[PDB]
Structure 1
Amino acid sequence: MIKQRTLKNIIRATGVGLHSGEKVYLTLKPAPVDTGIVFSRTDLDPVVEIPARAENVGETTMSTTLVKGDVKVDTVEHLLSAMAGLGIDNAYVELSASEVPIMDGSAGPFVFLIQSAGLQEQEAAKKFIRIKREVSVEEGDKRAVFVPFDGFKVSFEIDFDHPVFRGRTQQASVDFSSTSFVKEVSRARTFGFMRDIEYLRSQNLALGGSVENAIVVDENRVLNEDGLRYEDEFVKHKILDAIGDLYLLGNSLIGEFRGFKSGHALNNQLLRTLIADKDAWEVVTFEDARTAPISYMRP
C-alpha cells in the first residue's frame, strides 16, 4: 500500500513577502496521520491555526489567501505545490508574518529544503480523490476543468497578450511524477510585467518582488540578465501555481486537470464546485505501488 508521508526533520527558512515586503520566518514541522497541512501564525497571542482547505480560502487577489476571521496567511500556493510535488501529506507550517516567503519565486528552495530534511512514511493508507465524471467552471474568457485520467495530468494553455510571446499562446502538458515535478515544473519562477508592477509599488503593494526573486518583463524582452530557466518557463509556473491551489482539496487527485487562462480564483472555484458534486468523485487508496498509477520519490 501507499502510505501517508511527513517530514523526517525540522526545516527553517527566512525571506520576504512579495506583496507584504515584511521579513518572515517559516518553520516546517512533522505532523500526525490525517492532519493535512496547517498554517499557523505564531506571532499572535494566542496562536491562530488555519488548516489548508478550499473553504478557508477567502482572498484570491494575485495570491492564494487563507482566512480565519481577521487573520490571514498570504501567498500559500508555491510551498503547497512543493509539498504536493514531493507528496508531503501532513506537516505543520508556522509563520512569523502574514505572508509566506517568496524565496527565489519558484517551488525550488522548498524542494531542496524538504529533500535534505527527508520524508517519513506512516502506518495509514494515503487517501486519494478519484474523479468519476467531468466537472467545469467558466468565468468570462477564463475556463477550468476536472476530467478522468488514470494518474495525475495537468495541461495548460494561456493567451498572454504581450510582444515577448511572438503573438503565440503557451501550452504545456505534464504527467505527474516526483521526478516529473522536480526536473520540469519545480524551478518555474513567478513573473511580473512592468505595466501591472508600476501601480502596485507606488501604493506600497507588491514591494517584495525584484530580479532576485521574480521575472521582470519589459515590452522589448525579459530584463533578467540570464533569461529563462526553461524555454517553457511562464506556462510551467502557471502549472506550478495550479498544483498548489488544487492541493487545498486536502487530498491528492487522480484525474486530468485542464486550465485555460485560469487563475487562483477559478482554481479555488473548481474545488468547491467539485466537492459539492459528490456523484463526481469517490475516495480511493492503493494496496500496491504497482496498482497505484502515481510514483512518489521513495522516502
Structure 2
Amino acid sequence: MIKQRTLKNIIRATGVGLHSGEKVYLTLKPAPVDTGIVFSRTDLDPVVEIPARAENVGETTMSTTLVKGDVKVDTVEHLLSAMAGLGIDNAYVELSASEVPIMDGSAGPFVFLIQSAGLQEQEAAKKFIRIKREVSVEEGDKRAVFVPFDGFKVSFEIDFDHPVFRGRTQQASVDFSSTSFVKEVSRARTFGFMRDIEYLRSQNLALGGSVENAIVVDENRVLNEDGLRYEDEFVKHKILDAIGDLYLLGNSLIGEFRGFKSGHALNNQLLRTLIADKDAWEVVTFEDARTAPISYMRP
C-alpha cells in the first residue's frame, strides 16, 4: 500500500520569523498514525498545540496563520509545502515563538532538513482526498478551483504590472507525475517590493525580511546580488505557497488545483468550501503503491 509517513529522527533548526523578525527554534518530531501535522508553542506554559487543519486558520493577510484563541503560529505554508512535497502525514512541529522560521524564503532548507533526518513509513494506509466534481471559489478577479484529475497537478497565474514582471513567465503548470517538487518548486523564494516595505512594517509584516531570505524588487530590478534561481521563480513560489496552504486539508489530494491570482485567504476559502461540499470528494487509499496515480520518493 501507499503508507503514511513521519520523520525517522528529530530535526532541529534556528531562524527568524519573516513577519515578526523574532528568533525561533524549530523542532520536527515523529508522530503516530492519523496525528496529522500538529504545531506546538513550547515557549508557552502550559504548551499549546494547534493542529494544521483548515478550521484552525485564523488570519490570511500575507501568510497562513494558525490561531487557537490568542495563541498564533504564523507562516506555516512553506514548511507544510515541504511536508506535502515529501508525503509527511504525521509530525509534531515545536516552535519557541509565534512564527515558523523563514530560512532562505523557500522550502529548500525544509526538504533538505527532512530528507537528512529521513522519512519513516508507518503501518497505516495513506488517505487521499480525491476530487469527484469541480469546486471553485471566486472573489473579484481572484479564483481558486479544484477539478477531477487522476494524479496531482497545480496550475497558477499571477499578474503584476511591474517592470521586473514584464515579459517574464507569470503562468506555470506542474504535473507531479512528470516533475520533481524538490527540483522545480521547493527552491522558489518569497518575493517582496521596496515600494511596500514602509507600509508592511507599519502592519508588523516583513519585519524579518531582507535579501538573505527574500527576493527584493525595486523600480526596475531584483536587488539580490545573485539574481533569480528560476526565470519563473515568482509564479513557482505562488505554486509552493498553494501546495502549503492546501495541505491544511489534512491529507494529500488526487485532483488538479488552478489558482488565478489566489492567495492564502482564497486558498483557505476553497478548502472550507470543499470540506462543506461532501458530494465533490471521497477518501481513497492505494493498496499497491506501484499501480497508484501518484508516487513519493523512497523514504
TM-score when scaled to structure 2? 0.98
Alpha-carbon shift at residue 179 of structure 1 (Å): 6.1
Tell me if the contact between 1:75 and 1:99 (Cα under 8 Å) persists in the aligned partners. yes
Aligned to 2:60: 60
DSSP-derived class of the 1:114 partner: helix
- Work out the CA distance in 2 between the residues paired with 1:178 and 1:19: 35
DSSP-derived class of the 1:122 partner: strand
Alpha-carbon shift at residue 4 of structure 1 (Å): 0.4
> Alpha carbons of 1:14 and 1:180: their partners in 2 closer, same or farther (altered >3 Å)?
same
Q: Deviations over 1:201-260 (max 9, x none)?
A: 356542100011101001211111111001110000000000001000000000000000
> Alpha carbons of 1:145 and 1:255: their partners in 2 closer, same or farther (altered >3 Å)?
same
DSSP-derived class of the 1:105 partner: coil
- Work out the CA distance in 1 between the residues paired with 2:70 and 2:278: 31
Tell me if the contact between 2:169 and 2:235 (Cα under 8 Å) persists in the aligned partners. no
Alpha-carbon shift at residue 97 of structure 1 (Å): 0.3
- Work out the CA distance in 2 between the residues paired with 1:277 and 1:185: 30
Tell me if the contact between 2:63 and 2:75 (Cα under 8 Å) persists in the aligned partners. yes
Tell me if the contact between 1:157 and 1:169 (Cα under 8 Å) persists in the aligned partners. no
- Work out the CA distance in 2 between the residues paired with 1:220 and 1:264: 27
Tell me if the contact between 2:130 and 2:281 (Cα under 8 Å) persists in the aligned partners. yes
The answer to whether the aligner puts 1:186 opposite 2:186 as a matched pair is yes
Alpha-carbon shift at residue 161 of structure 1 (Å): 1.5
- Work out the CA distance in 2 between the residues paired with 1:178 and 1:68: 39
Q: Deviations over 1:108-147 (max 9, x none)?
A: 0011100110011111000000000000000101111000
- Work out the CA distance in 2 between the residues paired with 1:16 and 1:176: 31
DSSP-derived class of the 1:198 partner: helix
Aligned-residue CA RMSD (Å) = 1.3
- Work out the CA distance in 1 between the residues paired with 2:204 and 2:238: 25
Number of aligned residues: 299
Tell me if the contact between 2:151 and 2:177 (Cα under 8 Å) persists in the aligned partners. no
Alpha-carbon shift at residue 171 of structure 1 (Å): 0.7
Aligned to 1:233: 233
DSSP-derived class of the 1:15 partner: strand
Q: Which stretch shows the higher mean deviation, 180-189 or 157-166?
A: 157-166
Unaligned runs of 5+ in 2: none
TM-score when scaled to structure 1? 0.98
Alpha-carbon shift at residue 287 of structure 1 (Å): 1.1
Aligned to 2:214: 214
The answer to whether the aligner puts 1:39 opposite 2:14 as a matched pair is no
Tell me if the contact between 2:169 and 2:231 (Cα under 8 Å) persists in the aligned partners. no
Tell me if the contact between 1:40 and 1:47 (Cα under 8 Å) persists in the aligned partners. yes
Alpha-carbon shift at residue 164 of structure 1 (Å): 1.1
Tell me if the contact between 2:169 and 2:232 (Cα under 8 Å) persists in the aligned partners. no
Alpha-carbon shift at residue 198 of structure 1 (Å): 2.1
DSSP-derived class of the 2:164 partner: helix
Q: Deviations over 1:75-134 (max 9, x none)?
A: 000000000001111000000000110000000001110011001111100000000000
Tell me if the contact between 2:81 and 2:241 (Cα under 8 Å) persists in the aligned partners. yes
Tell me if the contact between 2:168 and 2:231 (Cα under 8 Å) persists in the aligned partners. no
Tell me if the contact between 2:134 and 2:148 (Cα under 8 Å) persists in the aligned partners. yes
Alpha-carbon shift at residue 177 of structure 1 (Å): 5.1
Q: Deviations over 1:42-88 (max 9, x none)?
A: 11111100000000001001010011011010000000000000111
- Work out the CA distance in 2 between the residues paired with 1:178 and 1:46: 46
Tell me if the contact between 2:34 and 2:90 (Cα under 8 Å) persists in the aligned partners. yes
DSSP-derived class of the 1:223 partner: coil
Unaligned runs of 5+ in 1: none
